[PDB]
Amino acid sequence: SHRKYEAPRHGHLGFLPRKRAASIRARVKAFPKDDRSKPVALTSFLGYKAGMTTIVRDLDRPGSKFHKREVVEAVTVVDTPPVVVVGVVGYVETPRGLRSLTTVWAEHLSDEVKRRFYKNWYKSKKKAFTKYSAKYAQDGAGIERELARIKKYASVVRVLVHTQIRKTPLAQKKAHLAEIQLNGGSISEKVDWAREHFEKTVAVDSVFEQNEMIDAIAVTKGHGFEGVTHRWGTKKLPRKTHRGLRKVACIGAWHPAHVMWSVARAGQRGYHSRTSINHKIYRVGKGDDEANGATSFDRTKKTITPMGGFVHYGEIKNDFIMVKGCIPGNRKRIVTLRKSLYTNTSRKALEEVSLKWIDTASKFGKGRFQTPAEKHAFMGTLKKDL
Template identity: 75%
Template structure:
């Protein structure tokens, strides 16, 4: 190893040899790579000394699997594939909708043999989704074609609520509110024979049956009055059983507890939080350039070769960030809480009579008044966003997915930072009646 001292440096400069036989291509001692000749008598060895302040290769920044990164076409998450149908299973629905309220944390004992935390307490983040009962208002039949599924017919219920009819109008206030008035007469004419005829066509020709269901958004604390409508596939049993099941649900509420179970692993479909037009450093996570870089640091220095004379699709560029349609798999249900239960946040270890709504309400959402789902971890979307919850597409057999969750504590303290009190009574007992009013 060459040591850089005064005499060593002079000797090193004298022993520098050109990399090739031309004088004009002499390699300077300041170049990151040069050749050192030890002596004329010893064997000539070439050593390459490189600067180590940066790498010359690195993995790309950001995934190309989600292109194009543009705004979602619809506000509600769309189910692009439902679970595979099994006629041997009983007839059941495969999805519901809810509204994201916020997050909190829970304490539980981990049941995972082999883990260092086995039989020990762990603190985990959870998301609360308010799920008021859905109302089934129709049924759709699909036939299989060489180009995929095609709608054969749609049958609607006789009575539809105004919050659903608002979905079919851009301006409900100025409209005549005549939607479905003519269709409702079909249920009364001839004893509803035309409706029965359409249902018989579904039984005879269709292979896939889906119900039309909408949320009861008026039961939440949201200001919006327009309900969200979606198709939910009916799985299990024969086609005749599916049609009978769907017809029996007309104008009836569907509780979330009738679709999902505790400890079940489900999928979440939603539109992420929007951030507008963002630069390349925030959008793709590219490295900032050095401090003295001309015309900015938060840029990509090289956006491609001279030819082909275009910017490739894989090059990170500025643009829309967020408000993308995303599907997150394998979210475990920690609890299905009832809105009518005054102690729907209590546990066997924490018998305090408290509800899931934290002190002061969920920030930017308010009070959870209806049934709710408690899912492990975070989910896409901002507060108040409609969330589509779907049964998992795969069969789960791992010990982690089949683990039985037993909660010991659910945090209901203020999410706005005003103390760690779990209930109003606890705050009064600690601070006093007059001070607790603040």
């Protein structure tokens, strides 16, 4: 017999299975569409989610009521030290898909990245890539031909890069490593560009620019084994109910005499791969610079790191990003940035953004002061201030 009063599917089934990811570093499924008219350049980036904060700016959409008025917006901050390019691989295409035929690395490597190759590093000979360097230590002994092979073949190229987890304030010492597709120019140009960029930093001033809409790709925060009621948004059953109300009551009919997949069920919430899009960048900023927190309107020399620091992160002394809104992922976590796939204009992706003020107050409480100068000014001296 039919459902007496209608209502929709609780939850979304495209996002199934709701299971723990394969990694703490979300796979980038898809990059943009390669084009040759442009120059060779990256199409992605890596950083570490630091936290959120709040800003002020003057909206401009001709027809709103806050047109040419102030707003206040929640932004999310990423610490993006420049990634060390080492290596590239070449993907030839088959009816069975793209396929790597070669992975060319660089001669010299950092302890962080070969640590990522290792697990127990403190008891190790640190024997890695030595015979690769000895394939190096000559002009081109067994490298030039791999490169020219990649030139003769390999419709697609992906550059291997790694992060600077020691430049971060974290406590890992184990670099993150990944690939990025290049979507510019020709293949020979891509590979020689990468050869030039072996062992070399690359930075966000080169990959991105303000008022660009992007995708944030990351793994969403783990919440353990969880009931159906938070995991799906199901109605709490009523008070008088023997044996539990944080449940689904019927989980299927007599026939088919099975539990349908679409029914809700308890289990893992979080640590899930997610790919959110259309996150306008509001500011690139520099580690090797002060006044990161200061707009043209404020001009009070102050960086972005609030008083007492980011909660669970620390400081932003590297190059960093401020993007509108939330993103998948929690603090201290990796994040994979990405150019869009589609030239969304919409009078929302083109809205040019200039900022006014940036909350650099303490998130470890309810902070009244953006600066200890301001603090001492408002308060006067103190007993400790001899």
